[PDB]
Design a protein around this ligand. Structure first.
Ligand code: ICS
Ligand code: CLF
Ligand code: CLF
Ligand SMILES: [Fe+3]
Ligand SMILES: [Fe+3]
Lengths: 477, 522, 522, 477
């Protein structure tokens, strides 16, 4: 399938839209040219979604509570507003952690102020204060509270900032107000930003003038790994076998103390640029801690990353880097030998959030597979700048793709495999196209690191080459 | 590390010594974690009567609720109409959640749109969203009807759905004749079932309110059936099956069973089956209207009686033996159709099963939760089985419902140690299953975390979960099951007795210790 | 001791300290028991490859067989005919056992008589027993037909059934025209399924051999279906349902579904439903005869082909996706009826479930046993699901069948680590599940003791049992289930994936240890 | 139900039979007169079953293997013959035991010679010898083997006696040949006899020269308790609380060594007279050991039994007897207080094997219930003698009842509860009559002793008064 054919695929699909939507969506679909270094010149992103077109996007609360703050394990996070948001997002994201749930860790629990009409009419700030006291009584080992605003809070003029200040002082407790209401921004993305700002204003500064921590020249923080299926653990182990000391994990399996200690580290290692570049830029400006982007999807990217990271340190670290790389070589090689022949030449379309649509391309290519289409729900142009060089020429890119668009693209392109989310999965299965969940890892993983690559490979193979797919047509047609 | 021919996923990978050591170092190094002895101490305390009393004094804090919000129910109701797109006016975050929540339970596509209201609409309203949304939806997804609900943002800012939809038509965004029923569905009022009721009354209104002049009760010789918020495919099926077997003309109003069970045959079908617009237009001509789940169909009931002039019979949800009997007897009365031999036999087969299994069921104690009609039917059937429904929790229950359940309890010796709870959540229920331990829980997937907590106190305190309800996310295909009618009763009995025998086999499987009672025959 | 408000049965009564001390004293004082260290040592040895090698050299000793004897099958076959009484000529102990065996599996009455031959009849033959027995049975239980098989006593002494039955009619003990089909069913030959085949051929013979002159193949426009030895009610039901959905005229020959599922409505019905005499008489006029379980219907096959002149189609048991498709296509061809949209959609729904659940099923390893046709169908569907049926055991299997199964294995990568065993028993199987541990067993209730043994080695070595087969005695109402057709495949898939997920939930329920992987959603 | 009505019931039911059958069955059906003390004068028993009438009876193999020998836990019992008998009788009877099954205990295992045609034609004696070697190899901790003959063995002229003697001498092992072929006798009964005789002849004499057993004045053996659901343990505990030493249990949870030590005891306590009066008489004749019958069903019988047993010993035992009776008084009284009011006046019909049809009457009466009908499959006239005084006047008695008879009797008598076996259970449940299994205890029990009465009471209540029984008639009929 050529560039001529993709540009015309786009035009034909757009023909169903009314005038205004056609003109909009046209700007969010492009054919890749790896020449282009300014994505701005070929695609736009981070704009409002067109009404009624079935975007796959969520809201700013998803971005703050479900994504950034939810994973912090020893704090209690309040879904503040009516009962929906907290319940739909209860334990749906596999941000793994070690803890005693209900006692010292609370990640899979749903704490909520369950707003009723009297709270909408008269405000919820009094309820919030009372809720905080009830939390302290029943969950004494919590090490701080966050307040994750749902839609109504700002609309009705509540002041959670004031409630947080007042109760924080009364109880000597870290209480973080987050104005992450879903009407804000256009997607999960502004939720990350907002949540980054909340960390900076209410937590990150807490030990600024405190020197008790014994620092080493090898201290790092893992920034923007939410430990999905254990992704951060299988990343951490490698960094530490390399001789580094991982002081913090933001925020998969993260603790509030780890967050507070992060300004003591020597290097911020950023996996998810989209969700945490904000706080990383802050830490560079305020504490002088540099940050760098890395990629632990597949052996090629993981090896490259370990090397880049080690180079920031000294020869003893660069030496251990090569020792780790030599250790895992036979393992990932056996994985390639086993699974690449089963996947070679197979073609994949991806649609995910703000990172993985580009970041996983290398791992697919380490199994001989081709990503012929990719896109993001809520990425900005700096993400697309990073994407166009990772994608092949004349590939299809889509921003905030509509359900209609995605279906029609898939019908024409006929990928061997699709990697996307839960709202997409069951659609493509019916069409007889193998589907892997690339948010939840389909209840598998980890996929990060050398150990994750094994699982990744096993997974793509089990699904792509499953006997079920030859059975969709009844032999009597 | 991995051995390539035996690759380990998260479990049990992270139990390897090197991950274990790493995890210990992170804890000790940077987590500033409470000592384990203190953790154990606080845990034991959360299992106590003292902790339970504090827990029950909560006013402001909810923890692990057992309900969702209105628009969820509105969506499910809308899905049950032919080529109908559910459309939630408001913020798009909500719709991603509704869809995913249902995707996970049904393992099916769940189609629903939003008109993506943002902070700008928060101060000039969402009228433009509705205009372009309706036009875009109609053209892109080609529905024959768009059924409009709201998110809490739209409710708070006060958008007038009726006027916005009328203006969309007036200004030519959609044809005048194109059906756009609507309902206000505030998430800060009631729960998901309230959303269902609101959506359904709105659709009935849309298709009948201004056309009552030519209607005549009984003229179509059919009985209307309104299922309410229903997440078992087998429940829609069993109702139609029994009515068909009876030779009874019926119209199931809101019927998603097809669109939630499309074949994987190489094509995606966005819409399938469902109640037709004609069926709704013609529903006032029915002999009567039967509500399967009366405790969340109150608004609907008022409209059916107030406008259609139907005399909605006082019937419980048809669960268990007595209530299935009553349902069929009422249908027989209304329709003039005798209960056929086939249903009479099925009934006796259920009774036969009760006689076969009664000795293992007898005296078994349960904690259970769910929506009010489901919960009361489950309670009823448990008493019919000689089981004790000790902890009965309906987070979205009300005073009047609780009175009713309480009377059903009082009418049986098996209801003696039972209490009904409303407004309470699964963190309340957690305390009850520690302080007054039942043999099992019957509940949804959120119950697994209570089982987990009970096993941590000890194996002899573990309370196993039996999954019946919504949502069930951690088992596959239970959404195909049936809980209504004799068929549903059979299914519940079988799952109950076998969960009992499974647990007994577990407790007696210890060689030379407890296996004297590991009987081949039970 | 007992507390009157909390009465303890054997479990856990005997764990009370006073019982425990008493049992210790009994053992120490009088049992002369091997020291525990020696028991532990022998146990570990029984789990080894070395022990496995000895175990597989057995020639004379059978331990925990996975089959029963001919007349059991003859009885079940007879039960499938209208107002027919199964009658086993021989010793009465046998019939008490047949009846109880089935009672426990079906939780139903099982009616069968014996003519109670004793020591005396062992040396002048049971002719007088037959005369009085036939007369007494007819008069007392008023059957319309009596179907005669034999116990091994009657076979060893050589009673000639045809003569004895002819002499009974000749001397006026029963009317000449009263139907008394018979079959010799020696228990030292084949197994229970052989008994079924023998009895069936015997009955088919009785009603057709002598009136073949007026038969014309195809004249009645129906297809005959012979189910074989079948102990799931859902299996008779699904076959009849699919053929009725196709609009296919059919005659199910031997149909016990009604008499094995009578309603508890205040009366005992000794007989119910069943294949009519007229149906058997007219059977040669069918277009053809389809054998649902060909591998134990060899004798029937020869009679149907040789005498009825039907060209019995080469069809596997309709289990799983491919073999159900094939069944349906052949039926379509024989009958002229297209496969309706209903069955196509059902097929599509099974395929959807396969796609939904494949990631948990993939690569799962199973040990399994049963009768030949059931076993090969289970094997075939496991391959379709991407599972590995590693230990395949058919005690009563034969060489031809094993080759057939091996060819099925060779046709899929998922058969690469699998082995088929014939003439081996559950003590052989027990070694394999220790030495080459699978993830689960799929089998009947006897398998519970293999799970017990495995657990005793250690929790990490436990192999859970998934109950599919006959007999199932330790769970209730599984005999209502379905294993044939798309419906059966759906049930099997569902039980498999959920057994997998139950076990994962168990292993990940440990607070702070393994619960990082205790996902709400799977 | 008057005497005249019961007599008419009998004649009317007999009207269905052909002449010969009615003449026979008339002799096996009787109306109780407790005055009559020679049962012979009112009922016949222990005769052949009439052909074709659906007797409930088993065979001699059931009585020997299933009943007497099977329960012995540290021996291996070979069902010698074709595969049926051993398989249908595998783990069907709840003769409970403590052991490591497959290692040192073998009760619920099915060992068989699985006779094929070549064994029928040429004999199974070589197969047996080979089978014994295979057993000894794969089950080394067995302490002896029994060979339980199925129908064909004797009919084909095999000589298991010789194989046992030869192989027993060769391996220095107790190997017991039992000629319990199911064509022998008329019922399970001859099986008990044959089984007792084999114990006498092949096991019981082994320690006749042994004086190493440390005997006491208080040694007893429990004879004829098969520990159904633990019945023998909940009997044993009382005897030992009374100060006795229970040397042996025949044969529930029984060991071969206990059997061998029984000739050393002071008193044989016989519960099941029918199945083990033979060996008890032999032990009196040969070793001078007295035997007595007892009854541990319900508080009345158990108290009377404890007292009669104690009276055979000295004052210290009679003192402990009274201490036991005082200990448990409040416990069984609490059971009566709770359950008798729920059961008072209720009418029961029983049909069971050789003992319980009379032995359980006192327990029913302790709950205010009335046994209006009873019968046995295979009892002898000395059993019916013991029965006529336990049964009320003008009650129905039936020997080797036919299926037709039992059904017709129940239809007319309309008892509130029926207690019988698995072949009967599902019939009467369909008729809407509460049914309890009185062989298997319906997977419950124990029923023996004080602890047993509590379970029996719970059980008769849960079933008799279950809500299911009022729901059998649909409301539209
Ligand atoms: S945070 Fe983001 S949508 Fe970077 S909101 Fe989303 S656990 Fe995605 S592509 Mo779900 S920017 Fe993480 C993400 Fe990526 S929840 Fe996970 S999979 S790497
Ligand atoms: S865009 Fe996002 S998820 Fe939507 S509400 Fe807003 S923060 Fe929340 Fe929770 S309660 Fe239900 S789902 Fe909404 S309607 Fe009110
Ligand atoms: S009266 Fe008794 S149970 Fe009957 S055979 Fe005889 S000893 Fe045995 Fe086992 S194998 Fe089957 S059931 Fe018989 S026919 Fe041959
Ligand atoms: Fe699906
Ligand atoms: Fe039954």
């Amino acid at each position: 399938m050529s560039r001529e054919e993709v540009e015309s695929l786009i035009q034909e699909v757009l023909e169903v839209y009314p005038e205004k939507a056609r003109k909009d969506r046209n700007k969010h679909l492009a054919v890749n040219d790896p020449a282009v270094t300014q994505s701005k010149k070929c695609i736009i992103s981070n704009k409002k979604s067109q009404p009624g077109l079935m975007t796959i996007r969520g809201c700013a609360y998803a971005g703050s509570k479900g994504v950034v703050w939810g994973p912090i394990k020893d704090m209690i996070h309040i879904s503040h507003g009516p009962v929906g948001c907290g319940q739909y997002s209860r334990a749906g994201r596999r941000n793994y952690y070690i803890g005693t749930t209900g006692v010292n860790a609370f990640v899979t629990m749903n704490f909520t102020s369950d707003f009723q009409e009297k709270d909408i009419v008269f405000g919820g700030d009094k309820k919030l204060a009372k809720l905080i006291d009830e939390v302290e009584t029943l969950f004494p080992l919590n090490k701080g509270i966050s307040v994750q605003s749902e839609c109504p809070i700002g609309l009705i003029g509540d002041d959670i900032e004031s409630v947080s200040k007042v109760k924080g002082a009364e109880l000597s407790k870290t209480i973080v107000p987050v104005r992450c209401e879903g009407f804000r921004g256009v997607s999960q993305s502004l939720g990350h930003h907002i949540a980054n700002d909340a960390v900076r204003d209410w937590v990150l500064g807490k030990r600024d003038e405190d020197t008790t921590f014994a620092s080493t020249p090898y201290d790092v923080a893992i920034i923007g790994d939410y430990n999905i299926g254990g992704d951060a653990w299988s990343s951490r182990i490698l960094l530490e076998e390399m001789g580094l000391r991982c002081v913090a994990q933001w925020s998969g399996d993260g603790s509030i103390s780890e967050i507070e200690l992060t300004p003591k580290v020597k290097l911020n290692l950023v996996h998810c640029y989209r969700s945490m570049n904000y706080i990383s830029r802050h830490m560079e400006e305020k504490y002088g801690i540099p940050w760098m982007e890395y990629n632990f999807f597949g052996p090629t990217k993981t090896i490259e990353s370990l090397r880049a990271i080690a180079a920031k340190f000294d020869e003893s670290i660069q030496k251990k880097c090569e020792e780790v790389i030599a250790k895992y070589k036979p393992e990932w090689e056996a994985v390639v030998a086993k699974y690449r022949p089963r996947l070679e030449g197979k073609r994949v379309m991806l649609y995910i959030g703000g990172l993985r649509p580009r970041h996983v391309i290398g791992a697919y290519e380490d199994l001989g597979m081709e990503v012929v289409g990719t896109g993001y729900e809520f990425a900005h142009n700096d993400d697309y700048d990073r994407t166009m060089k990772e994608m092949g020429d004349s590939t299809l890119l889509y921003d905030d793709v509509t359900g209609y668009e995605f279906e029609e693209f898939v019908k024409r392109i006929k990928p061997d495999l699709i990697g996307s989310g839960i709202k997409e999965k069951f659609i493509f299965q019916k069409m007889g196209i193998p589907f892997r969940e690339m948010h939840s890892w389909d209840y598998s993983g980890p996929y990060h690191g050398f150990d994750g690559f094994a699982i990744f490979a096993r997974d793509m193979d089990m699904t792509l080459n499953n006997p079920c797919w030859k059975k969709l047509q009844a032999p009597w047609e | 590390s991995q051995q390539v021919d035996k690759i380990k996923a998260s479990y049990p990978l992270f139990l390897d010594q090197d991950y274990k050591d790493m995890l210990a170092k992170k804890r000790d190094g940077f987590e500033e974690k409470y000592p384990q002895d203190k953790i154990d101490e606080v845990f034991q305390w959360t299992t106590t009567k003292e902790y339970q009393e504090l827990n029950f004094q909560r006013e402001a804090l909810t923890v692990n609720p057992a309900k969702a919000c209105q628009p969820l129910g509105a969506v499910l109701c809308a899905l049950g109409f032919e080529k109908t797109m559910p459309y939630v006016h408001g913020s798009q975050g909500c719709v991603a959640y509704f869809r995913s929540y249902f995707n996970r339970h049904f393992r099916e596509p769940v189609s629903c749109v939003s008109d993506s209201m943002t902070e700008d609409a928060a101060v000039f309203g969402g009228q433009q969203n509705m205009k372009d949304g309706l036009q875009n939806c109609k053209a892109t997804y080609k529905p024959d009807m768009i059924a409009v609900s709201t998110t809490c943002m739209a409710e708070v800012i006060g958008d007038d759905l009726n006027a916005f939809i009328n203006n969309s038509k007036k200004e030519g965004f959609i044809p005048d004749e194109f059906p756009v029923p609507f309902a206000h569905t505030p998430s800060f009022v009631g729960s998901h079932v309230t959303g269902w009721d609101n959506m359904f009354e709105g659709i009935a209104r849309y298709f009948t309110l201004k056309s009552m002049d030519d209607k005549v009760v009984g003229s179509n010789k059919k009985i209307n059936i309104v299922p309410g918020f229903e997440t078992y495919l087998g429940n829609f099926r069993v109702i139609k099956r029994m009515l068909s077997e009876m030779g009874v003309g019926y119209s199931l109003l809101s019927d998603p069973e097809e669109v939630l069970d499309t074949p994987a045959d190489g094509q995606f079908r966005m819409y399938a089956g469902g109640t037709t617009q004609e069926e709704m237009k013609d529903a006032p001509n029915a002999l009567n209207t039967v509500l399967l789940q009366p405790w969340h169909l109150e608004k609907t009931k008022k409209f059916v009686e107030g406008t259609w002039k139907h005399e909605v019979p006082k019937l419980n949800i048809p669960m268990g033996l007595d209530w299935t009997d009553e349902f069929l007897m009422k249908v027989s009365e209304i329709s003039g159709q005798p209960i056929p031999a086939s249903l009479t036999k099925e009934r006796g087969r259920l009774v036969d099963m009760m006689t076969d299994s009664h000795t293992w069921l007898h005296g078994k104690r349960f904690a259970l939760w769910g929506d009010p009609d489901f919960v009361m039917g489950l309670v009823k059937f448990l008493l019919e089985l000689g089981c004790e429904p000790v902890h009965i929790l309906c987070h979205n229950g009300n005073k009047r419902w609780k009175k009713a359940v309480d009377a059903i309890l009082a009418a049986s010796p098996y209801g003696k140690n039972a209490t009904v709870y409303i407004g309470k959540d699964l963190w309340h229920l957690r305390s009850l299953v520690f302080t007054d331990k039942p043999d099992f829980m019957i509940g949804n997937s959120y119950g697994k975390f209570i089982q987990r907590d009970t096993l941590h106190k000890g194996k002899e305190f573990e309370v196993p979960l039996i999954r019946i309800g919504f949502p069930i996310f951690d088992r596959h295909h239970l959404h195909r099951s049936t809980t209504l009618g004799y068929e549903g009763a059979m299914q519940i009995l079988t799952t109950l007795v076998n969960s009992i025998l499974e647990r007994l086999d577990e407790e007696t499987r210890g060689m030379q210790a407890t296996d004297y009672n590991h009987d081949l025959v039970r």
